[PDB]
């Protein structure tokens, strides 16, 4: 008598990464990284027409 | 805690200046400059058919 229990394969997954600069919705924003946002209070962006 | 509040930008526009001459309306009129319209009394154009 011989009886075994095999393992016939093991399948993994590749997590995928989106950059958000690589997509189309990035046109809709002017991104600038401001490292002092944490140290800030109130931002103003002023207009004259 | 060090804080600030920033002016993050200032935007202006350009008031755009149109000339009656770059138009298609100007084909519907003969335009002449007549600095003495002030001193005129009655102008007349006369026709013969």
Structure report:
This is part of a larger assembly, with two copies of chain A (49 residues). Chain A is largely without helices or strands. Helix content of chain A is 0%, strand content 10%. At the A-B interface, β1 of A face β1 of B. Chains A, B: This is Major capsid protein.
Write the topology of this structure:
The structure is cut from a larger assembly and holds two copies of chain A (49 residues).
Chain A: E1 44-48
**Distance separating the two termini of chain A:** 92 Å
Largest interface pair: A-B, 12 and 12 residues
Q: Could you give the count of β-strands of chain A?
A: 1
Looking at how many chains there are and whether they match, the oligomeric state comes to part of a larger assembly
Helical element count of chain A?
Answer: 0
State the secondary-structure class of chain A: little secondary structure
Shape of chain A: elongated
- Give the helices and strands of chain A as they follow along the chain: E
Q: Percent of residues of chain A in helical segments? A: under 10%
**Major sheet summary line of chain A:** none
Taking all Cα atoms into account, the compactness measure Rg of chain A is 26 Å
In percent terms, what proportion of residues of chain A is strand?
Answer: 5-15%
Organism (chains A, B): Human herpesvirus 2
Protein name (chains A, B): Major capsid protein
PDB class: virus
Keywords: herpesvirus, capsid, cryo-em, atomic structure, virus
């Amino acid at each position: 008598d011989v009886e075994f229990d095999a393992l016939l394969g093991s399948y993994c997954n590749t997590l995928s990464l989106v950059r958000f600069l690589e997509l189309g919705l990035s046109v809709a924003c002017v991104c600038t990284k401001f490292p002092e946002l944490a140290y800030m209070n109130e931002g103003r962006v002023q207009f004259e027409v």
